[PDB]
Amino acid sequence: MTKGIGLNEVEIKSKVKVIGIVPESKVRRKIMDMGIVRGTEIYIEGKAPMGDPIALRLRGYSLSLRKSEAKDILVEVLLEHHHHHH
C-alpha cells in the first residue's frame, strides 16, 4: 500500500499488486475483461526485445499485455529485499 505507479514503470520478474485502474479509459474495460481486478497480483515475466509489450503472469496464467494497458494499471511495489543485479 503506497502511492501507486503504472505497471509500465515496473521491470522484469517483479511482483506488484493492483491498487486501482484509470476508469473511463475504455482500456479500463480491456483490463477488467482480461480478468484483472482490484487486489490481483501481477508477476512480470519479462519484456519484449522492443520494451513493449510486456509478458505478465496474473489470475493464473501467463499472457502478454501492452505497455499501453500497463499504463492504465496503478500498482504498488510488494517486493523489497535485495534485487539481483545479475
Short mmCIF file of N, CA and C in Angstrom, two decimals:
data_model
loop_
_atom_site.label_atom_id
_atom_site.label_comp_id
_atom_site.label_asym_id
_atom_site.label_seq_id
_atom_site.Cartn_x
_atom_site.Cartn_y
_atom_site.Cartn_z
N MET A 1 0.84 -1.22 0.00
CA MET A 1 0.00 0.00 0.00
C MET A 1 0.86 1.25 0.00
N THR A 2 0.99 1.86 -1.17
CA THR A 2 1.72 3.10 -1.33
C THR A 2 1.09 3.92 -2.46
N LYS A 3 1.66 5.07 -2.77
CA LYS A 3 1.25 5.83 -3.94
C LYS A 3 1.59 5.02 -5.19
N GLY A 4 0.55 4.55 -5.86
CA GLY A 4 0.72 3.61 -6.95
C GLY A 4 1.33 4.23 -8.19
N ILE A 5 2.19 3.47 -8.83
CA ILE A 5 2.75 3.85 -10.11
C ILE A 5 2.12 3.00 -11.19
N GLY A 6 2.43 3.28 -12.44
CA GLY A 6 1.89 2.48 -13.51
C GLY A 6 2.68 1.20 -13.68
N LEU A 7 1.99 0.14 -14.09
CA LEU A 7 2.62 -1.16 -14.30
C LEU A 7 3.68 -1.08 -15.41
N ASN A 8 3.58 -0.03 -16.21
CA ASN A 8 4.52 0.21 -17.30
C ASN A 8 5.86 0.73 -16.77
N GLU A 9 5.88 1.08 -15.49
CA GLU A 9 7.06 1.64 -14.87
C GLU A 9 7.78 0.59 -14.03
N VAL A 10 7.36 -0.66 -14.17
CA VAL A 10 7.97 -1.77 -13.45
C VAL A 10 8.87 -2.56 -14.40
N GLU A 11 9.79 -3.33 -13.84
CA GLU A 11 10.74 -4.09 -14.64
C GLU A 11 10.47 -5.59 -14.51
N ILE A 12 11.30 -6.41 -15.15
CA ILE A 12 11.07 -7.84 -15.26
C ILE A 12 11.16 -8.56 -13.92
N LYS A 13 10.40 -9.65 -13.81
CA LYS A 13 10.42 -10.55 -12.65
C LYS A 13 10.24 -9.80 -11.34
N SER A 14 9.23 -8.95 -11.29
CA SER A 14 8.87 -8.25 -10.07
C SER A 14 7.39 -8.45 -9.78
N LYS A 15 7.02 -8.37 -8.51
CA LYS A 15 5.64 -8.55 -8.11
C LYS A 15 5.04 -7.26 -7.59
N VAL A 16 3.88 -6.92 -8.13
CA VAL A 16 3.16 -5.73 -7.74
C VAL A 16 1.68 -6.04 -7.61
N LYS A 17 1.00 -5.30 -6.77
CA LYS A 17 -0.41 -5.51 -6.54
C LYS A 17 -1.22 -4.42 -7.22
N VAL A 18 -2.33 -4.81 -7.79
CA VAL A 18 -3.19 -3.88 -8.50
C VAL A 18 -4.01 -3.07 -7.51
N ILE A 19 -3.51 -1.88 -7.19
CA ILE A 19 -4.22 -0.95 -6.33
C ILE A 19 -5.51 -0.52 -7.00
N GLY A 20 -5.38 0.02 -8.20
CA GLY A 20 -6.53 0.51 -8.92
C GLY A 20 -6.29 0.63 -10.40
N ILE A 21 -7.30 1.13 -11.08
CA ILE A 21 -7.30 1.27 -12.53
C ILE A 21 -7.70 2.71 -12.88
N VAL A 22 -7.40 3.15 -14.09
CA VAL A 22 -7.74 4.50 -14.52
C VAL A 22 -9.04 4.48 -15.33
N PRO A 23 -10.17 4.64 -14.63
CA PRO A 23 -11.51 4.39 -15.19
C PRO A 23 -11.85 5.28 -16.39
N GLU A 24 -12.86 4.85 -17.13
CA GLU A 24 -13.39 5.58 -18.29
C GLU A 24 -12.36 5.67 -19.43
N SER A 25 -11.23 5.00 -19.27
CA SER A 25 -10.19 5.00 -20.28
C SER A 25 -10.54 4.06 -21.44
N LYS A 26 -11.66 3.35 -21.29
CA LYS A 26 -12.09 2.32 -22.24
C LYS A 26 -11.20 1.08 -22.14
N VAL A 27 -9.88 1.28 -22.10
CA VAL A 27 -8.95 0.18 -21.87
C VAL A 27 -9.13 -0.36 -20.45
N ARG A 28 -9.79 0.44 -19.61
CA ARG A 28 -10.19 0.00 -18.28
C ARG A 28 -11.08 -1.24 -18.40
N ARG A 29 -11.92 -1.24 -19.43
CA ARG A 29 -12.75 -2.39 -19.76
C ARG A 29 -11.86 -3.56 -20.18
N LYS A 30 -10.90 -3.27 -21.05
CA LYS A 30 -9.96 -4.27 -21.55
C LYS A 30 -9.24 -4.97 -20.40
N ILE A 31 -8.73 -4.18 -19.46
CA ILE A 31 -8.03 -4.70 -18.29
C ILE A 31 -8.96 -5.60 -17.46
N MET A 32 -10.16 -5.10 -17.19
CA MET A 32 -11.14 -5.83 -16.39
C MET A 32 -11.57 -7.11 -17.11
N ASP A 33 -11.70 -7.02 -18.43
CA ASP A 33 -12.12 -8.15 -19.26
C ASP A 33 -11.06 -9.25 -19.25
N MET A 34 -9.80 -8.85 -19.14
CA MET A 34 -8.69 -9.80 -19.06
C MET A 34 -8.73 -10.58 -17.75
N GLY A 35 -9.48 -10.06 -16.78
CA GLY A 35 -9.61 -10.74 -15.51
C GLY A 35 -8.79 -10.08 -14.42
N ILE A 36 -8.30 -8.88 -14.69
CA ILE A 36 -7.54 -8.13 -13.70
C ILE A 36 -8.46 -7.24 -12.89
N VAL A 37 -8.38 -7.37 -11.58
CA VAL A 37 -9.25 -6.63 -10.69
C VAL A 37 -8.46 -6.02 -9.54
N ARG A 38 -9.11 -5.15 -8.79
CA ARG A 38 -8.51 -4.54 -7.61
C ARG A 38 -8.14 -5.61 -6.59
N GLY A 39 -6.84 -5.85 -6.43
CA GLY A 39 -6.38 -6.83 -5.46
C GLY A 39 -5.60 -7.96 -6.09
N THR A 40 -5.60 -8.03 -7.42
CA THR A 40 -4.85 -9.07 -8.12
C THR A 40 -3.35 -8.81 -8.03
N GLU A 41 -2.58 -9.88 -8.04
CA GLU A 41 -1.13 -9.80 -8.02
C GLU A 41 -0.58 -9.95 -9.42
N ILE A 42 0.32 -9.07 -9.77
CA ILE A 42 0.92 -9.06 -11.09
C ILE A 42 2.37 -9.52 -11.02
N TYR A 43 2.69 -10.58 -11.76
CA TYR A 43 4.06 -11.03 -11.85
C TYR A 43 4.58 -10.79 -13.25
N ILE A 44 5.52 -9.87 -13.37
CA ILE A 44 6.14 -9.60 -14.65
C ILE A 44 7.11 -10.72 -14.99
N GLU A 45 6.89 -11.39 -16.11
CA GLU A 45 7.78 -12.45 -16.54
C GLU A 45 8.99 -11.83 -17.24
N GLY A 46 8.71 -10.99 -18.22
CA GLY A 46 9.74 -10.32 -18.96
C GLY A 46 9.15 -9.29 -19.90
N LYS A 47 9.99 -8.59 -20.63
CA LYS A 47 9.52 -7.61 -21.59
C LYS A 47 9.98 -8.02 -22.98
N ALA A 48 9.29 -7.55 -24.00
CA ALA A 48 9.68 -7.81 -25.37
C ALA A 48 11.02 -7.15 -25.66
N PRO A 49 11.76 -7.63 -26.67
CA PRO A 49 13.05 -7.04 -27.07
C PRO A 49 12.92 -5.58 -27.49
N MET A 50 11.68 -5.13 -27.68
CA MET A 50 11.42 -3.75 -28.07
C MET A 50 11.00 -2.92 -26.86
N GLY A 51 10.91 -3.58 -25.70
CA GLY A 51 10.46 -2.91 -24.49
C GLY A 51 8.95 -2.98 -24.33
N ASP A 52 8.29 -3.30 -25.43
CA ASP A 52 6.84 -3.41 -25.48
C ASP A 52 6.46 -4.45 -26.53
N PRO A 53 5.48 -5.32 -26.25
CA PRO A 53 4.73 -5.32 -24.99
C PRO A 53 5.46 -6.04 -23.85
N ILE A 54 4.72 -6.35 -22.80
CA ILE A 54 5.29 -6.98 -21.62
C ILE A 54 4.62 -8.34 -21.38
N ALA A 55 5.37 -9.30 -20.85
CA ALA A 55 4.82 -10.60 -20.53
C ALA A 55 4.46 -10.67 -19.05
N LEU A 56 3.19 -10.90 -18.76
CA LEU A 56 2.71 -10.91 -17.38
C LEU A 56 2.17 -12.28 -17.00
N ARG A 57 2.19 -12.58 -15.72
CA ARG A 57 1.53 -13.77 -15.21
C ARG A 57 0.62 -13.38 -14.06
N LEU A 58 -0.67 -13.36 -14.34
CA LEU A 58 -1.68 -12.93 -13.39
C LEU A 58 -2.92 -13.79 -13.52
N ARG A 59 -3.75 -13.79 -12.48
CA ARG A 59 -5.00 -14.56 -12.45
C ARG A 59 -4.69 -16.04 -12.24
N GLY A 60 -3.88 -16.59 -13.14
CA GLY A 60 -3.45 -17.96 -13.03
C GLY A 60 -2.65 -18.40 -14.24
N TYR A 61 -2.48 -17.50 -15.20
CA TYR A 61 -1.85 -17.83 -16.47
C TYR A 61 -0.97 -16.70 -16.98
N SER A 62 0.00 -17.07 -17.80
CA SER A 62 0.90 -16.13 -18.43
C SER A 62 0.31 -15.61 -19.74
N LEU A 63 0.41 -14.30 -19.95
CA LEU A 63 -0.02 -13.68 -21.19
C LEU A 63 0.64 -12.31 -21.35
N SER A 64 0.71 -11.82 -22.57
CA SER A 64 1.38 -10.56 -22.84
C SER A 64 0.38 -9.43 -23.05
N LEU A 65 0.54 -8.39 -22.25
CA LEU A 65 -0.24 -7.17 -22.39
C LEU A 65 0.69 -6.05 -22.82
N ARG A 66 0.14 -5.01 -23.42
CA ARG A 66 0.95 -3.94 -23.95
C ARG A 66 1.24 -2.91 -22.87
N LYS A 67 2.29 -2.13 -23.09
CA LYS A 67 2.65 -1.05 -22.19
C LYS A 67 1.50 -0.05 -22.07
N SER A 68 0.70 0.05 -23.13
CA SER A 68 -0.48 0.90 -23.14
C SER A 68 -1.46 0.50 -22.03
N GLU A 69 -1.74 -0.80 -21.91
CA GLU A 69 -2.60 -1.29 -20.84
C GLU A 69 -1.92 -1.13 -19.49
N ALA A 70 -0.63 -1.44 -19.46
CA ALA A 70 0.17 -1.34 -18.24
C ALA A 70 0.22 0.11 -17.73
N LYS A 71 -0.04 1.05 -18.63
CA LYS A 71 0.00 2.46 -18.27
C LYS A 71 -1.29 2.88 -17.56
N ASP A 72 -2.33 2.07 -17.70
CA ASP A 72 -3.63 2.38 -17.11
C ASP A 72 -3.80 1.65 -15.78
N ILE A 73 -2.88 0.73 -15.50
CA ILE A 73 -2.92 -0.04 -14.26
C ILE A 73 -2.01 0.59 -13.21
N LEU A 74 -2.58 0.95 -12.07
CA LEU A 74 -1.81 1.52 -10.98
C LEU A 74 -1.50 0.45 -9.94
N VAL A 75 -0.22 0.20 -9.73
CA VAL A 75 0.21 -0.90 -8.86
C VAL A 75 1.13 -0.42 -7.74
N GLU A 76 1.21 -1.23 -6.69
CA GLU A 76 2.10 -0.98 -5.58
C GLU A 76 3.21 -2.03 -5.54
N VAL A 77 4.43 -1.58 -5.27
CA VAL A 77 5.57 -2.49 -5.21
C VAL A 77 5.53 -3.30 -3.92
N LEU A 78 5.49 -4.62 -4.06
CA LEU A 78 5.41 -5.50 -2.90
C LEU A 78 6.77 -6.06 -2.53
N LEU A 79 7.65 -6.12 -3.51
CA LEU A 79 8.94 -6.75 -3.35
C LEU A 79 10.03 -5.74 -3.02
N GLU A 80 10.56 -5.85 -1.81
CA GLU A 80 11.77 -5.13 -1.44
C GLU A 80 12.62 -6.01 -0.54
N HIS A 81 13.80 -6.38 -1.02
CA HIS A 81 14.70 -7.24 -0.27
C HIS A 81 16.14 -6.90 -0.62
N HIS A 82 16.57 -7.34 -1.79
CA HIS A 82 17.91 -7.05 -2.30
C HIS A 82 18.02 -7.56 -3.73
N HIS A 83 17.55 -6.73 -4.66
CA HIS A 83 17.39 -7.12 -6.06
C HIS A 83 18.68 -7.67 -6.66
N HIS A 84 18.55 -8.78 -7.36
CA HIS A 84 19.67 -9.37 -8.08
C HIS A 84 20.02 -8.53 -9.29
N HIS A 85 21.25 -8.05 -9.34
CA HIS A 85 21.69 -7.25 -10.48
C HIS A 85 22.34 -8.13 -11.54
N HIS A 86 22.54 -9.40 -11.20
CA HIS A 86 23.00 -10.39 -12.17
C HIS A 86 22.20 -11.67 -11.98
#
